[PDB]
C-alpha cells in the first residue's frame, strides 16, 4: 500500500534506548486493528538519525516479522552519501518490505543534478519501489517538481512524500508525472488539503496516536467527502500542531506512553525528555481529539 | 592554533573517489608555506558526508603524518547522534590533532536543551579542545547565543565557528562568554566583517586557493588594520561568493585542480562534476583574485 493513512511509526525503546519488542508489537497490533494502510519503519519519527545501520535494519526486520503479513511495511532508507543509501537499501532486498522511503541527502546540499544521480543510482541497485522524500526544513535541500518529473521516469521510483507544507507542489508535480505516480503528504496539518488537491494519502505522525481517526479521514478524502473529513481534521488539528511543540518525536512518544501504547517514552540524545509544559500541551491536544 | 586563517581543507581524490596522498601532501606543503594557521581535516568542505568513519579517520591521520608538526590539524568530528559523536572523538585520542570541530546535529533538529546536552557529553568524554560549529542552512537547526554561553562554561569547549552570516551573533556571543573564548567566522563572504566586530579568525573555503592573501588579511584584521585587510578582501570577494556557485566543495576542488594543487577534481555522489558555466564563473573569480 502507498495510499491512505501511512504511519511514520515511532521506534519504542526501553530505558536503555534500545528497541522495545513488546511495545513494538502493541503498536503494530494497534495499526492492524485501526485500519492504518502501511507502516514506515525507521524514518524521521522512528529516530533513523540516532540508530546505526545494523540497529535500523534490526528494527525494520522486527517490524516486518511482527506485522506478519497483516499490514505492509515500508523501510526508511535515507542516507546523505549515495553509496550508503545503496548499502542500506540492499539490506532489505528480497526481505518482504513493500518499498522504501528515501530522503533527499541532508547537510551536504546537492544540486538538482546531484539529487537526480543519487536517486537514480539507488533505484538502479534495487528491485524495491522507491518513494522520494522531500523535507527541506531538516535537510537544507529542496527537491523541485521538475526534478521529480525527471525521476518519475525511472521504473521503480513510484511516488513522493512531500513535507514542505507548500500545497502548490501537488499540482506542479501531478502535471509532470503519470496518473499512477503516488502523491503523499508529509505534513499532518496540511495533509487533508494536500489530498483535496489530488494527493493520495499521508505519511503521518498523528497516526501514531490517532490511527483510527486518521484512517477514517483519508478514506473520506479518497471518496470525495471532504466536509466530513474536515470534521475529523478539526478534532485532530491541535495534535497536528502540538506534536511538534517540542522536536519530533519527543511529543508523539510521550503521547504513546500516555495512551499506554508503549512502555516508556525514552529517546536517544540529542532528543531530550519532554518538558513539563510540553506534557500539558500534548495532554490537552489528546483530550481535544477525544483520546482521553 | 585556533585564530587567523584556518583552512577547511578539501579531501583530494583520484578518479575512483579515493583519497590521493600526493595531492594532499601538495596542499599541506602549500598551507605550511603560505602561513595558514591550521588545517580543518574532513569537515564539510572535506566531504565528511561521503566518507565513512574509517576513511574519515584515515584522512585525518594521513593529514597529521604529512603535516609532520609543521601546521596544527583540527579534526571534523560532527555527528547527529551523541553516542556516535563521542565514538568518533575517541578515534582521535592522542592522535596529535590539536582540537575538534563539532557541528550541531543535522536533520533531527534538537532543542537548545538537546544541543546543550549533546556538546556537554562530547566534551566530558575527551581532553581535546572542542570548537562548536553552527551552520543552520545545512543542519536545519540554529545554536543560539544563550546556549553558546552555557556551553562556554565547559572547560574544553573553547570556541565557535559561526556560519550563519548573521553578524549580530558576534557580539551577542561575546557578551556571554569569557574573553578567551574563540569566535571564528564560518562564512567567507562576511568573515572580514565578522573579524572587525570582534571575531578572531575564519574557517575558510577560499583559503584552499588563496592561502597567503587569507593569512595576511586575517593578520591585518587582528591588528586592527581593517582598511588594509579590506583591500585584500575585495580582490577575494568574487571567490568568497563564486566558490558556492555550485554546491561546495565542487567549485573549490575544480579551482584546486585548475591551479595544479590537486591531480583530479573528483568528488563522491551526491556531489556531481562542475558545469561549464560553473568553470567560467570560477575561472573569472580566480583571475580577479590574481591566481590565474
Ligand atoms: K543514523
Ligand atoms: K516510475
Ligand atoms: K559520513
Ligand atoms: K570553556
From Swiss-Prot, chains A, B:
Substrates-to-products reaction catalysed: L-aspartate 4-semialdehyde + pyruvate = (2S,4S)-4-hydroxy-2,3,4,5-tetrahydrodipicolinate + H2O + H(+)
Marked site (Part of a proton relay during catalysis) residue numbers: 44, 107
Swiss-Prot/TrEMBL keywords: Allosteric enzyme, Amino-acid biosynthesis, Cytoplasm, Diaminopimelate biosynthesis, Lyase, Lysine biosynthesis, Schiff base
Mutagenesis / variant outcome for changing residue 138 to A/H: Strongly increased KM for L-aspartate 4-semialdehyde. No effect on KM for pyruvate. Reduced activity by 99.7%
Effect of residue 107 to W: Reduced activity by 95%. Reduced affinity for both substrates. Exists as a mixture of monomer, dimer and tetramer in solution. Has significantly lower thermal stability than the wild-type enzyme
Site-annotated residues for L-lysine inhibitor binding: 49, 80, 84, 106
Result of changing residue 44 to S: 8% of wild-type activity. 4-fold decrease in affinity for pyruvate, but nearly no change in that for (S)-ASA
Activation and inhibition: Is allosterically regulated by the feedback inhibitor (S)-lysine. Is inhibited by pyruvate analogs such as 3-fluoropyruvate, 2-ketobutyrate, glyoxylate, and beta-hydroxypyruvate. Is not inhibited by its substrate, (S)-ASA.
InterPro entries: Aldolase_TIM (IPR013785), DapA (IPR005263), DapA-like (IPR002220), Schiff_base-form_aldolases_AS (IPR020625), Schiff_base-form_aldolases_CS (IPR020624)
Principal localisation: cytoplasm
Pathway: Amino-acid biosynthesis; L-lysine biosynthesis via DAP pathway; (S)-tetrahydrodipicolinate from L-aspartate: step 3/4
Active site: 133, 161
Protein name: 4-hydroxy-tetrahydrodipicolinate synthase
Gene that produces this protein: dapA
Amino acid at each position: 500500500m502507498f495510499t491512505g493513512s501511512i504511519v511514520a511509526i515511532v521506534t519504542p525503546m526501553d530505558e536503555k534506548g534500545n528497541v522495545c519488542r513488546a511495545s513494538l508489537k502493541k503498536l503494530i497490533d494497534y495499526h492492524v486493528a485501526s485500519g492504518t494502510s502501511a507502516i514506515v519503519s525507521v524514518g524521521t519519527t522512528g529516530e533513523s538519525a540516532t540508530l546505526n545501520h545494523d540497529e535500523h535494519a534490526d528494527v525494520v526486520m522486527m517490524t516486518l516479522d511482527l506485522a506478519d503479513g497483516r499490514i505492509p511495511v515500508i523501510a526508511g532508507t535515507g542516507a546523505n552519501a549515495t553509496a550508503e543509501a545503496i548499502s542500506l537499501t540492499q539490506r532489505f532486498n528480497d526481505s518482504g518490505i513493500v518499498g522504501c522511503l528515501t530522503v533527499t541527502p541532508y547537510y551536504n546540499r546537492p544540486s538538482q543534478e546531484g539529487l537526480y544521480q543519487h536517486f537514480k543510482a539507488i533505484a538502479e541497485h534495487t528491485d524495491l519501489p522507491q518513494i522520494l522524500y522531500n523535507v527541506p526544513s531538516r535537510t537544507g535541500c529542496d527537491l523541485l517538481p521538475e526534478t521529480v518529473g525527471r525521476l518519475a521516469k525511472v521504473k521503480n521510483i513510484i511516488g513522493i512524500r512531500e513535507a514542505t507544507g507548500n500545497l502548490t507542489r501537488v499540482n506542479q508535480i501531478k502535471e509532470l508525472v503519470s496518473d499512477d505516480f503516488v502523491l503523499l503528504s508529509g505534513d499532518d496539518a496540511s495533509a487533508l488539503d494536500f489530498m483535496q488537491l489530488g494527493g493520495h494519502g499521508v505519511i503521518s505522525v498523528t497516526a501514531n496516536v490517532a490511527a483510527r481517526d486518521m484512517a477514517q479521514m483519508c478514506k473520506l478524502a479518497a471518496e470525495g467527502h471532504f466536509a466530513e473529513a474536515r470534521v475529523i481534521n478539526q478534532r485532530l488539528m491541535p495534535l497536528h500542531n502540538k506534536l511538534f511543540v517540542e522536536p519530533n518525536p519527543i511529543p508523539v512518544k510521550w503521547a504513546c506512553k500516555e495512551l499506554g501504547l508503549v512502555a516508556t517514552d525514552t529517546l536517544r540524545l540529542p532528543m531530550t525528555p519532554i518538558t513539563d509544559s510540553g506534557r500539558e500541551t500534548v495532554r490537552a491536544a489528546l483530550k481535544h481529539a477525544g483520546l482521553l
